[PDB]
Design a protein around this nucleic acid. Structure first.
Ligand SMILES: [Mg+2]
Lengths: 603, 1337
DNA sequence: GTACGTCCGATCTTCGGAAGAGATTCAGAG
DNA sequence: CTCTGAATCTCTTCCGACGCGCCGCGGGACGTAC
RNA sequence: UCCGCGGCGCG
């Protein structure tokens, strides 16, 4: 290829070929005049290393380079490694009709539909638009169609709306690890230069919105479109193929809203009356005459399929809160009422939706998830809970616990100075007493923060669960942990040195209070170790995954029943203490090798 | 106590601990490094003179000739910085040196030379130093990074457990010279001492020892002790020494003087040791069975026979004892050979030794280092003398010598650059001692084991390589010298040295194209320490320990600043107050502490000295007399945090800011957030982008002024005064009388740098920030630059922040933004792109550069003038034609008969430049560079005339002001000596010469000054001619090009959803949807917030200081709008003075102690109106204000104590049940926009090697499927899908054309065809001698 | 100073980690 | 003493994520005609 | 420039 100007860009193969043909010409003219044997032997040898280097540079002995110090390319260099033709151009290749952009949410959509920019829709479906407009007879040749789409009149946006109506497309993310990493939706046109996606799919994708890039491709033929619509829909992909855990779990926000919903105080505005139906409940809630989480005697009429699939309606009066009735409005017929009469934990609601899918079906499950999410955001916005500086109730006993621990370690040091204990033994006992003090202060802080709320209860006084915002954000299970809040309020405890040993000096302060130079400096060790491990592990994970996948590419189910009578005796695992995995969770969903009999022998 | 401009806007500051030392100059490492290499230091050291004396003395092979050196000199630059960056030429200076050539006479080498000749000779060209410390090569500034590497010296490594799989850990010795071959000694699983030269094969240790003409007996004497056996009245006995009996079980009853001292067969005890040392037991007789397991050391020969009774290193037997007894040898000497102390490793190795001659050892090493060559003793000697004793090939630096002496516990820290015999001997002794278990190895992770390089070091190394090559050539020529028939210029070539320096400056591993978009970006890029590069570890081979932070890293290298990715822990940055050692190590300042008082003296401590001492922490409270009120204070001995007595320390920390680097030091409330979030936040601030209009940050750290002054982007005054004239492009200062020099008074001119291209396609612009007529002091700001405001650096903007979940638009990190913020366009940023246009010299005629092109529209050429270049300031769309260009092709082949046939039925080809599609804007500036010898178009003529009038304006104004000063001094002189007060100014100044005066100095000085006036006009005109010739002359370009055209297009990039926003804590986020002004929540007052965040990120990530900055923002905004409301009504200044005094006096004991009683009322009201946009607050790093101080600031205003405020809904307008934390926070915009990574393609070009779509954005391409994507898709059951992925859209050209025709026909059908990449692989394997085929269908 | 003919040396060095080939050997039965 | 000889020691090779985004350099020297 | 190398940055 000629580069800029009258110069040309050459490959190493050209230079290798010219070198070997020059050496061949040297051989040809050399034997013409009967050259001496030493010279012809040396020249033939030089030809041998020349042809060997053309085959492979530096495979035997020293390599050779061009003008640049980089070694010359070989014939095998188009096969070996990533730069080889296999992994660079054969197994994978660049494909036309593709797009890449940045993701956003746009939570006003459905699970099976996603947004897409106007310009990207115009660019991607150019031949389809051309064909449709030619069918409608708005042009004669392609050039007129090209001019009109270059003018982007209003007569083409309606056509683009028409072509997208039922056409599905697929979405892809770069670091996919599971088959659910690619899903196909029906795109919906939206203005802007970004793409909106349903909040559920990113949790399965393990993708946040910090600026990650997204890939999109389009099925062309009818068979491609219908086979896309067939298998990889969001409705058809709700459970992980690896384990029976559903992938439709709500992560952070709507679970927080629902947890705030089903938390009833002892007394508030509009307390202690009766009410007929959840329509009146939401009427009262919007009227503002009663608290959203006030306990009220109400009646419901739920449906139970205890018959042979026949749903029977039963009615009675129940004691509950307003918000539970409001969420009972959105419940379909088949659910029993007792499932929503508690704190509605994240695991609890996950089990609830799993039971709903396994009992009622699929369409009620996905629609129930959709409007549950809608109502969750609605009531979360109505709530408006926020974090505060005073949300970390500092226990008053922290200082005296610190003083007691300091006195104890001073006593231990005094014992050491008397020549009565070794350095290792005193080191261990100081570690033990620091751990004991940490556990005591942790218990004190959690006791202080768990139930400090006090209310006159329209009586004398009482104590109930704590309405600390951090306590709801932690106990709901959305984000955080007991260790995290423990570090937030109490002292963070002890940490280990980079060598693997643990420093004796504790971090006797929380992040709310100030920290000295030394504690931050030592915690830098652990932070750096964690980040280094996270950065380094990815390459090893990728290598091992590729090694695992490259060997099992052939095993495919081919027959129905091999008809063999050989099975395995497998037992629940017990290391010696508590049973680790029960047999029921290990044998579930498998075909019995033989007719297993009850221990009623001969039965 | 503050200057004039500081009093314009003073920032309120917190802080209790008094400072003792100011922040040093940040850009000091590079300046200190380079102000040693060009400076002509006396007597030569660490500079050019060292390498000169190292290589310049050269002599021929006894040809009675020698070249030597006298002195060097550097010339002035041919161009200034601005012209060099505009044209793209290097900013370099000449290198001039004078050399002497001498030729000795025959039959007298020591006699005086025949003749000498002297000349000046030129070679090489090095770049200069910018004040900002950058290097401009091709019109692009570049920055070199300092390299960290292992310090030269000796080393000891252990290898715990990994090798031999048995726990028998080996030990090795690493010798790393500064410039020479490495040397390695190693152990074996059989405990054999072995050596390896340059990582070659394994050879025994004693080979070199006997190669140094050492007898085996001498080696045994050096490395072993003596045990003496003496023949007496009954055979053999031994002299007993107590220390030779430690930890041993007796072989017999140890009795002497007829008394039992140690019983038979029992272990020696400490009581028995005392018995032995008290009884003075010199001798004892031992049975020969105990002796029969020992080895003789020296060679004993019978003099009568002249034969060897027993050889050296031979185990002794009773027959040999009888032979030596009967031969008359009564003296027997053996070795101690202790089981635990002195193992016979050397003796065993000598037993295994196959060679026992100096000649044999020389032949062995000679054949091992080069197989297949004949051995010779002289050749072996010549090789060995060049191994570790030739200065030319082997050289250890002085610092390496000092490290070597320190590791061997020597006394002189100085020595030669080569090793010695005793060096090898005591190194072997040290390895033996470490093998014995006494002593400890030296870790490589410790800071004192590494040295930091500098630009001068690598510059000198590359210079030395170039000079040794060229001196090899010069010596080759000098071996063929003549009788002064040649010129001293011809043998020397400047080409190799220049090539060596330009390859180092251009494309070295450490000569990367530097990044510059923000002042902090350069100040943190220059202060970078890298472990990569030549002489450094590779990215893949790095383990955890090299990335790990050492306990000694405190106060020297910042552990809180490092990039994240494949390279973490290797691109670390040094601390703030850290400085360099003379040897090349790192040091940190400390405060001298007496017995009870901490003296304000500052000492500098090396990297090792802190181990022997103990240091107190900075935050240690104390009295006003230096006495710590506590007696048990937290300190560290060797990185162990512990509490010691009241008086046991020597030094204490200078301040709390000597721990982190400058990048992390700009984050307030750092102690209340997690370290990892601090890392990502520092990275985000490192990736900032300037905006059109900046606003001051409410929360400051203190060094923002230091950051601004340390950056050269601002024209800081070198001399104070009062500004005479002000303009948007030029500033002139009237110099004060004290600061001005007597002769050539002068007034300085500052020329601002206007809109110009940055390395990140952004704009670098400077604007004035001072009024007219105000006084200015020295070292003060005059005109702000990008993101700079009145002497401080302002990056982001203050937004009314709120923390609550709003309808899920803030799901995890998304954020909703009002259009109110973009109504003023305060977050809109500018972007500028450079377009290249070349008029190359090609075959068949050069290409032509006009717009006379067929097949174009009239409107296409309408924008272009008659010259073919669009007018300045014309709006352009995407994909339009920029300029017209046509290229001749030739190939006429004129047919005289068939010419008419060419017209019956049925050249220069256009190559017009077009703007890439998708980007629009308005053209700003077009620059054309024309090589000399080619006619210049009119457009270039008016461009040159633009530059001409610019130069004429500057020269005329400076000449006019100089003439004004000269005529003023002429009038002042003429007032005395012929007094004419009113006669002088009646007449115009054009005639001030021939006034009638008598014979004094005044009249003669008048003619002299008229002559000086004419002379100054003359040199002014000469300078004008030189400058206009330089501008109008052609410029050197690439071969085969006539001229090059540069195009600058400016685009105003507005905000839009998809952009990446972030704060100052790593709290990332992407804007999701703009929402109308009405729908945000609003308060009782009626001012709604504009940005809403996600409160749920606080529980997850260990960062909580955001609430603190939020409350500080509330306090600052309350003070600011209280001031604004107070000033809105016309009010008297005393109330404002009282209120501001109350505000500034609020707080605990601080170092501010400011009052308004010393300020003019005009200055007071100017500050007051300057503070109406908020009250700036400064906080220290770790001595920041606590919650109580926030409480007093809140109670000063009318805000609630808790800070949380009830809000009204914006969607429907109702009260929320809970109060919500709201406030103001300094949010940052970063360079990663949304419409710069987004791209799509339906159909485009295909590669030539394979018919596949391209990629990227410079080429219209698409994304690529991976093998992992293939696995993901084949996990599902879609079989056809992958088939059309790999068939329809990828390879089959016939198939893709046919389906395209089908699609435009409305049918969507798939036909496979055949992939051609498989055919390509088939042809590849067919090129090899292996036959591929395809069988029957 | 530019088109063209023609070919390309004394030399760095610091990775686990294993797989595998080959060299050596010293251990024991004949 | 000898001849395998298996067992161990020593030398040589290949392999280390995955998409990108942007930027910068790119045969060159070097003698021979002319 | 059609590709290679190097650098930096992003996930
Ligand atoms: Mg991400």
């Amino acid at each position: 290829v000629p580069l800029d100007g009258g110069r040309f860009a050459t490959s190493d193969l050209n230079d290798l070929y010219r070198r070997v043909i020059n050496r061949n010409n040297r051989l040809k003219r050399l034997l013409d005049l009967a050259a001496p044997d030493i010279i012809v032997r040396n020249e033939k040898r030089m030809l041998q290393e020349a042809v060997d280097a053309l085959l492979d540079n530096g495979r035997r002995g020293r390599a050779i380079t061009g003008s640049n110090k980089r070694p010359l390319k070989s014939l095998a260099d188009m096969i070996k490694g990533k730069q080889g033709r296999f992994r660079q151009n054969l197994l994978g290749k660049r494909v036309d009709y593709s797009g890449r952009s940045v993701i956003t949410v746009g939570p006003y959509l459905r699970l099976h539909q996603c947004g897409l920019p106007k310009k990207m829709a115009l660019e991607l479906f150019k031949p389809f638009i051309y064909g449709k407009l030619e069918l409608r007879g708005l042009a004669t040749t392609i050039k007129a169609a090209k001019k009109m789409v270059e003018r982007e009149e209003a007569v083409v946006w309606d056509i683009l709306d028409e072509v997208i109506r039922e056409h599905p497309v697929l979405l892809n993310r770069a670091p996919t690890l599971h088959r659910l990493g690619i899903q196909a939706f029906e795109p919906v046109l939206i203005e802007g230069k970004a793409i909106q996606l349903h909040p559920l799919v990113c949790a399965a994708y393990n993708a946040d919105f910090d600026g990650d890039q997204m890939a999109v491709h389009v099925p062309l033929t009818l068979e491609a479109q219908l086979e896309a619509r067939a298998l990889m829909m969001s409705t058809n992909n709700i459970l992980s193929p690896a384990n029976g855990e559903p992938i439709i779990v709500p992560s952070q926000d709507v679970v927080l809203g629902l947890y705030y919903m089903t938390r009833d105080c002892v007394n508030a505005k509009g307390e202690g009356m009766v009410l007929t139906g959840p329509k009146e409940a939401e009427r009262l809630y919007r009227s503002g005459l009663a608290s959203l989480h006030a306990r009220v005697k109400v009646r419901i009429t739920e449906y139970e399929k205890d018959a042979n699939g026949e749903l029977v309606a039963k009615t009675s009066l129940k004691d509950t809160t307003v918000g539970r009735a409001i969420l009972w409005m959105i419940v379909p017929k088949g659910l029993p009422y007792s499932i929503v009469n508690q704190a509605l934990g994240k695991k609890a609601i996950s089990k609830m939706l799993n039971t709903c899918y396994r009992i009622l079906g699929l369409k009620p499950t996905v629609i129930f998830a959709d409007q549950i999410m809608y109502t969750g955001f609605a009531y979360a916005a109505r709530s408006g809970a926020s974090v505060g500086i005073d949300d970390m109730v500092i226990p008053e006993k922290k200082h005296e616990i610190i003083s007691e621990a300091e006195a104890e370690v001073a006593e231990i040091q005094e014992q050491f100075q008397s020549g009565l204990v070794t350095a290792g033994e005193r080191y261990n006992k100081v570690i033990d007493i620091w751990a004991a003090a940490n556990d005591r202060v942790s218990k004190a802080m959690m006791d202080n923060l768990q139930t400090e709320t006090v209310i006159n209860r329209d009586g004398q006084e009482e104590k109930q669960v704590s309405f600390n915002s951090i306590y709801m954000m932690a106990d709901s299970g959305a984000r955080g942990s007991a260790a995290q809040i423990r570090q937030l309020a109490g002292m963070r405890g002890l940490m280990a040195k980079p060598d693997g040993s643990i420093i004796e000096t504790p971090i006797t302060a929380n992040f709310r209070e100030g920290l000295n130079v030394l504690q931050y400096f030592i915690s830098t060790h652990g932070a750096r170790k964690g980040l280094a491990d996270t950065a380094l592990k990815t390459a090893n994970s990728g290598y091992l995954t590729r090694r695992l996948v490259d060997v099992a590419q052939d095993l495919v189910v081919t027959e129905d029943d091999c008809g063999t009578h050989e099975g395995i005796m497998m037992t629940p695992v017990i290391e010696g203490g508590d049973v680790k995995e029960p047999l029921r969770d290990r044998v579930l969903g498998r075909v019995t090798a033989e007719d297993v009999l009850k221990p009623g022998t001969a039965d | 106590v503050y200057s004039y401009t500081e009093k314009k806007r003073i920032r309120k500051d917190f802080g209790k601990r008094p400072q003792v030392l100011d922040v040093p100059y940040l850009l000091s490492i590079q300046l200190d490094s380079f102000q040693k290499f060009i400076e002509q230091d006396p007597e030569g050291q660490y500079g050019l003179e060292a390498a000169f004396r190292s290589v310049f003395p050269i002599q021929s092979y006894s040809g009675n000739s020698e070249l030597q050196y006298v002195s060097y000199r550097l010339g002035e630059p041919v161009f200034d910085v601005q012209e060099c960056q505009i044209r793209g030429v290097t900013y370099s200076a000449p290198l001039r040196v004078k050399l002497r050539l001498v030729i000795y006479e025959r039959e007298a080498p020591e006699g005086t030379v025949k003749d000498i000749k002297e000349q000046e000779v030129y070679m090489g060209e090095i770049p200069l130093m910018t004040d900002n410390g950058t290097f401009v090569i091709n019109g692009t500034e570049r920055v070199i990074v300092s390299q960290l590497h292992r310090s030269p010296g000796v080393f000891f490594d252990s290898d715990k457990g990994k090798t031999h799989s048995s726990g028998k850990v080996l030990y090795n010795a690493r010798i790393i010279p500064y410039r020479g071959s490495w040397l390695d000694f190693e152990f074996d699983p059989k405990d054999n001492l072995f050596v390896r030269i340059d990582r070659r094969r394994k050879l025994p240790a004693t080979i070199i020892l006997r190669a140094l003409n050492y007898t085996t007996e001498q080696i045994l004497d050096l490395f072993f002790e003596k045990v003496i056996f003496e023949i007496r009245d009954n055979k053999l006995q031994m002299e007993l020494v107590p220390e030779r009996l430690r930890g041993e079980t007796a072989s017999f009853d140890i009795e002497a003087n007829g008394k039992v001292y140690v019983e038979k067969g029992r272990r020696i005890t400490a009581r028995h040791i005392r018995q032995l040392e008290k009884d003075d037991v010199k001798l004892i007789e031992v049975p020969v069975e105990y002796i029969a397991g020992k080895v003789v050391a020296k060679d004993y020969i019978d003099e009568s026979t002249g034969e060897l009774i027993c050889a050296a290193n031979m185990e002794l037997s009773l027959d040999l004892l009888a032979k030596l007894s009967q031969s008359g040898h009564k003296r027997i000497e053996t070795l101690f050979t202790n089981d635990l102390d002195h193992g016979p490793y050397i003796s065993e190795t000598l037993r295994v030794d196959p060679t026992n001659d100096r000649l044999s050892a020389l032949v062995e090493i000679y054949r091992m280092m080069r197989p297949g060559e004949p051995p010779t003793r002289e050749a072996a000697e010549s090789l060995f003398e060049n191994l570790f004793f030739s200065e030319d090939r082997y050289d250890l630096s002085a610092v390496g010598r000092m490290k070597f002496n320190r590791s061997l516990l020597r006394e002189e820290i100085e020595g030669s650059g080569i090793l010695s015999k005793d060096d090898i001997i005591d190194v072997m002794k040290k390895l033996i001692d470490i093998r014995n278990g006494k002593g400890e190895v030296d870790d490589i992770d410790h800071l004192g084991n590494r040295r930091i390089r500098s630009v001068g070091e690598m510059a000198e190394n590359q210079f030395r390589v170039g000079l040794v090559r060229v001196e090899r050539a010069v010596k080759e020529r000098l071996s063929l010298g003549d009788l002064d028939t040649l010129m001293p210029q011809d043998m020397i070539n400047a080409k190799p040295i220049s090539a060596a320096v330009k390859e180092f400056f251009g494309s070295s591993q450490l000569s990367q194209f530097m990044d510059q978009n923000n002042p902090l970006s350069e100040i943190t890029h220059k202060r970078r320490i890298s472990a990569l590069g030549p002489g450094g570890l590779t990215r893949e081979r790095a383990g955890f320990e090299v990335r790990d932070v050492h306990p000694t890293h405190y106060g020297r290298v910042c552990p809180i600043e490092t990039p994240e990715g494949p390279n973490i822990g290797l691109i670390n940055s040094l601390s703030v107050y850290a400085q360099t050692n003379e040897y090349g190590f790192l040091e940190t300042p400390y405060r001298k502490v007496t017995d009870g008082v901490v003296t304000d003296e500052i000492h500098y401590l090396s990297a090792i000295e802190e181990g022997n001492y103990v240091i107190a922490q900075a935050n240690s409270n104390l009295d006003e007399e230096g006495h710590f009120v506590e007696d048990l204070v937290t300190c560290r001995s060797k990185g162990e945090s512990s509490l010691f007595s009241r008086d046991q320390v020597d030094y204490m920390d200078v301040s709390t800011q000597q721990v982190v680097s400058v990048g992390a030091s700009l984050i307030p409330f750092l102690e209340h957030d997690d370290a990892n979030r601090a890392l990502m936040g520092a990275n985000m601030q490192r990736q900032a982008v300037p905006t059109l209009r900046a606003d001051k940050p409410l929360v400051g750290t203190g060094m923002e002024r230091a950051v601004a002054v340390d950056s050269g982007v601002t024209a800081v005054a070198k001399r104070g005064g009062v500004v005479q004239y002000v303009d948007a492009s030029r500033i002139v200062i009237k110099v004060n009388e004290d600061e001005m020099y007597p002769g050539e008074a002068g007034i300085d001119i500052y020329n601002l740098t206007k809109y110009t291209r940055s390395n990140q396609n952004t704009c670098i612009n400077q604007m004035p920030c001072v009024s007219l007529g105000e006084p200015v002091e020295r070292g003060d700001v005059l005109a702000d630059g990008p993101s700079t405001d009145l002497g401080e650096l302002a990056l982001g903007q203050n937004m009314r922040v709120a923390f609550m979940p709003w309808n899920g638009y803030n799901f995890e990190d998304s954020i909703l933004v009002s259009e109110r913020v973009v109504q003023e366009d305060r977050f809109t940023t500018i972007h500028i792109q450079e377009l290249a246009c070349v008029s190359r010299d090609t075959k068949l005629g050069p290409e032509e550069i006009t717009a006379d092109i067929p097949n174009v529209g009239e409107a296409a050429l309408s924008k272009l003038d008659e010259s073919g270049i669009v007018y300045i300031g014309a709006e352009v769309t995407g994909g339009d034609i920029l300029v017209g260009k046509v290229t001749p092709k030739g190939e006429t082949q004129l047919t005289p008969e068939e010419k008419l046939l060419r017209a019956i039925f049925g050249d220069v080809k256009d190559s017009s430049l077009r703007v890439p599609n998708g980007v629009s804007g308005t053209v700003i500036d077009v620059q054309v560079f024309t090589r000399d010898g080619v006619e210049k178009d009119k457009r270039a003529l008016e461009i040159e005339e633009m530059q001409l009038k610019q130069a004429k304006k500057d020269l005329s104004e400076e000449l006019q002001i100089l003439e004004a000063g000269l005529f003023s001094r002429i009038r002042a002189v003429l007032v005395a000596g012929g007094v004419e007060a009113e006669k002088l100014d009646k007449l115009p100044r054009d005639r001030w010469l021939e006034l009638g005066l008598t014979d004094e100095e005044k009249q003669n000085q008048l003619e002299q000054l008229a002559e000086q006036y004419d002379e100054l006009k003359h040199e002014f005109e000469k300078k004008l001619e030189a400058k206009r010739r330089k501008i109008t002359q052609g410029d050197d370009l690439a071969p085969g090009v006539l001229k090059i055209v540069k195009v600058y297009l400016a685009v105003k990039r507005r905000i839009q959803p998809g952009d990446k926003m972030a704060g100052r804590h790593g709290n990332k986020g992407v804007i999701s949807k703009i929402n109308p002004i009405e729908d945000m929540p609003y308060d009782e007052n009626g001012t709604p917030v504009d940005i809403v965040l996600n409160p749920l990120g606080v529980p997850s990530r260990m960062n909580i200081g955001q609430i603190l900055e939020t409350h500080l923002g509330m306090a600052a905004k309350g003070i600011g709008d209280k001031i604004n409301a107070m000033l809105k009504q016309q009010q008297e200044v005393a109330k404002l003075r009282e209120f501001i005094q109350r505000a500034y006096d609020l707080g605990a004991d601080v170092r501010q102690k400011v009052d308004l009683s010393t300020f003019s009322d005009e200055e007071v009201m100017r500050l007051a109106e300057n503070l109406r946009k908020g009250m700036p607050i400064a906080t220290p790093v770790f001595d920041g204000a606590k919650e109580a101080e926030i409480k007093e600031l809140l109670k000063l205003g009318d805000l609630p104590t808790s800070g949380q405020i009830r809000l009204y809904d914006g969607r429907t307008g109702e009260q929320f049940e809970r109060p919500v934390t709201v406030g103001y926070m300094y949010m940052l915009k970063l360079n990663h926009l949304v419409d710069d990574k987004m791209h799509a393609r339906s159909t485009g070009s295909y590669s030539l090697v394979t018919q596949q779509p391209l990629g990227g954005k410079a080429q219209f391409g698409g994304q690529r499927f991976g093998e992992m994507e293939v696995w993901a898709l084949e996990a599902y059951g879609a079989a056809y899908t992958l088939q059309e992925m790999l068939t329809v859209k990828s390879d089959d050209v016939n198939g893709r054309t046919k389906m395209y025709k089908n699609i435009v026909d409305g049918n969507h059908q798939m036909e496979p065809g055949m992939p051609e990449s498989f055919n390509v692989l088939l042809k590849e394997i067919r090129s090899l001698g292996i036959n591929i085929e395809l069988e029957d269908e």
